């Protein structure tokens, strides 16, 4: 007598017994129906796939805040970042030296973090040339450590000393590469190896001019003695006796180190140099250290590549992308569009919201250019999570972020008011 309406209405309403439902809520939690709730409301929560431990400790957020200068925007009292001395470097301490992150980070910190003389000499032709180089070593010196196990061990495997030498070069270790040369009664090399580090055309030509001759009825020559002269010619990969063959067992990075050490084909910019390597060789798929290079390599096209890149790979961590754009934007380092920046600031500031770490969210939120949006978010974020942003999160985050005196009092008053009746 009561089931016919449930049937009538269930039916007069196109309602299958399959009817389910789910709705996200203010805190960002969704309410699925499961039968697991006193009233069947599975209030599951939203996963912050943002995996990086240090984000959960006051210290980082707290300390990284002193790294900035906040100032109310031009169209309202809502704070926005004026100046930020933020470098990839900063992050290194909170990570561990064995993770790929430390690398990705340590790398960027090298490719983008500013270089600097530690004494005031001003021949701009000089200072500009030093930093030019400081950045050079810094990077090769790194790859030397990344290919250390790789090559070092690949050396235990050789009966051939000449091949052994070519290997020591591959690690940019001339001193030991030379010692070996003399000790094996293969001295003439110790000489070239001497020149290798410099840029002398005499040699260069002496090398190449010889190479050409070596292709005419003159065999029984080590592939190693040849490969080595090749390292003198200048461009080794685009050569008359190319090394492009090495792609077989050498880490692409092993090769790159070559083009950066002996491949100074022309005396120009590094960024463009790196870029030269990328042209002859295909890169490792899904690789973060890889991508980061393309970004460095594609100088002015920076933002364009980024867009291009993010559209194909999940290798670059939201938080990274953000920290990138930001460290690059506040150092003049590259060319980044307001639309694209804020575009990725939301991204991050969002993950930080699902995690509930509002302190971080609000802070990243200041990296918003659109004064309307900034205000828009901030008012929202704070109005809902005031209690959480109060008494112990360090006791003042909000005053620290130059947030509006009124907003605080307003949203505050509102909850006290809310709790007021609940009691």
């Amino acid at each position: 007598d009561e089931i016919d309406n449930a049937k009538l209405i269930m039916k007069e309403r196109r309602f299958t017994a399959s009817y389910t439902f789910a709705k996200f809520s203010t805190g960002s939690m969704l309410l699925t129906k499961d039968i697991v709730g006193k009233s069947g409301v599975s209030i599951k929560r939203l996963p912050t796939e943002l995996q990086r431990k240090f984000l959960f400790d006051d210290v980082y957020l707290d300390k990284e805040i002193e790294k900035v200068t906040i100032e109310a925007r031009k169209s309202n009292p809502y704070p926005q970042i004026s100046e930020s001395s933020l470098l990839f470097k900063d992050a290194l301490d909170y990570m561990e030296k064995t993770s790929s992150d430390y690398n990705l980070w340590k790398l960027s910190s090298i490719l983008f973090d500013p270089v600097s003389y530690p004494y005031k000499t001003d021949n701009d032709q000089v200072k500009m040339a030093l930093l030019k180089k400081e950045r050079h070593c810094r990077l090769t010196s790194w790859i030397v450590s990344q290919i250390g196990p790789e090559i070092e061990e690949k050396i235990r495997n050789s009966s051939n000393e000449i091949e052994q030498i070519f290997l020591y070069l591959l690690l940019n270790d001339v001193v030991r590469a030379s010692k070996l040369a003399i000790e094996s009664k293969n001295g003439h090399l110790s000489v070239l190896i001497s020149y290798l580090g410099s840029n002398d055309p005499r040699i260069r030509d002496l090398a190449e001019l010889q190479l050409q001759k070596w292709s005419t009825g003159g065999c029984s020559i080590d592939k190693n003695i040849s490969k080595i002269y090749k390292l003198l010619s200048g461009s080794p990969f685009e050569g008359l006796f190319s090394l492009k063959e090495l792609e077989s067992e050498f880490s692409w990075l092993c090769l790159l180190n070559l083009t950066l050490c002996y491949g100074q084909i022309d005396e120009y910019s590094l960024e463009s140099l790196v870029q030269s390597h990328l042209d002859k060789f295909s890169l490792p798929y899904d690789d973060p250290i890889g991508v980061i290079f393309q970004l460095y390599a594609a100088n002015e096209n920076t933002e364009k590549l980024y867009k291009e890149v993010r559209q194909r790979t999940n290798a670059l961590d939201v938080q990274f992308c953000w920290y990138l754009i930001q460290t690059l934007r506040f150092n003049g380092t590259r060319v980044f569009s307001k639309e694209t920046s804020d575009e990725a600031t939301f991204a991050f500031a969002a993950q930080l919201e699902f995690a509930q770490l509002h302190g971080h969210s609000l802070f990243v939120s200041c990296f918003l250019n659109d004064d309307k949006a900034a205000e828009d978010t901030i008012k929202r974020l704070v109005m809902r999570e005031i209690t959480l942003l109060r008494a112990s999160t360090n006791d003042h985050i909000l005053n620290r972020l130059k947030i509006p005196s009124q907003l605080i009092f307003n949203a505050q008053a509102l909850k006290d008011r809310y709790e007021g009746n609940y009691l």
Binding site: I9, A22, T26, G27, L31, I43, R310, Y422
Partner: protein, 285 residues
């Protein structure tokens, strides 16, 4: 037995619910644990949807129902009594929703007779009801409010006061508060081949590219993107189609993730890729 809609309170403290047994239960969730607090009974028919008003007006919660009546329950010190009731429609009332807290305390209700009432609140226990007859052909199911958007003087701006709404005619009509006082249908949206089930006006992340989602008996979910360069040009885009009906759709706040409820008792999550095509992030349950 089976619940219909249940929505968390602002400040995430309570959790009102309603099921086909005509009971509007308000459960508290402190620490993740559910704890009933009152069973507001009062509908002659199953309750459909339910919505919490903005804490700025105290603690209010309204519930509509198949009983053709809608109830508004206030709260005064634990005193969960109903301060007002409204039976202005002849057929069941499929949905309710509150207007963004700035417009005031306005409540929108779409019935099944094909109408739409709008309870505005006044100084005391008074409520005027500007109504919209024959809004949809066979009735209305969804009612969603367009996000409050602000347009040299001492004034709180006059907003565009819009609010979309799907129904049994397949049309998702948008609406607008005419400067004089009544609402008119700014535009129709006919992309669905059968009953529109739910229509949700995604919240603007400050961003001007306002969106809106809809799901219907045909089993398709559309996202009407719109660049209102002063003219109504709503270009629908297909999210996905399941061989079974989709019952509900909701927007996650920050990312604009769509929770797609419908089909196989399963609920899905979606996010529009850096490419423009929407994707399923995961399967709930």
């Amino acid at each position: 037995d089976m619940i219909h809609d249940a929505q968390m309170d602002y400040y995430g403290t309570r959790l009102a619910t309603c099921s086909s047994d005509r009971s509007v239960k308000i459960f508290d969730v402190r620490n993740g644990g559910q704890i009933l607090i009152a069973d507001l009974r009062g509908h002659e028919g199953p309750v459909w949807q339910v919505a919490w008003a903005h804490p700025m007006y105290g603690n209010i919660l309204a519930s509509c129902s198949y009983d053709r009546k809608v109830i508004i329950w206030r709260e005064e010190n634990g005193t969960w009594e109903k301060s007002h009731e409204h039976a202005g429609h002849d057929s069941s009332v499929n949905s309710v929703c509150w207007a963004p807290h700035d417009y005031g305390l306005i409540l929108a209700c779409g019935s099944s007779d094909g109408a739409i009432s709008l309870l505005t609140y006044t100084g005391e226990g008074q409520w005027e009801v500007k109504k919209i007859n024959n809004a949809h052909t066979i009735g209305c199911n969804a009612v969603s409010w367009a996000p409050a958007v602000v347009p040299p003087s001492g004034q709180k701006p006059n907003y565009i006061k819009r609010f979309a709404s799907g129904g049994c005619d397949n049309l998702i009509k948008l609406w607008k508060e005419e400067e004089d006082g009544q609402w008119k249908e700014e535009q129709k949206l006919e992309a669905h081949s059968d009953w529109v089930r739910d229509v949700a006006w995604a919240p603007s992340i400050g961003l001007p590219t306002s969106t809106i989602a809809s799901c219907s008996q045909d089993g398709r979910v559309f996202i009407w993107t719109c660049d209102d360069a002063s003219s109504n040009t709503w270009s629908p885009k297909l999210l996905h189609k399941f061989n079974d009906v989709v019952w509900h759709v909701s927007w996650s706040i920050t990312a604009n993730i769509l929770a797609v409820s419908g089909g196989d008792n399963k609920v899905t999550l979606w996010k529009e890729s850096v490419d423009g095509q929407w994707v399923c992030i995961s399967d709930v349950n």
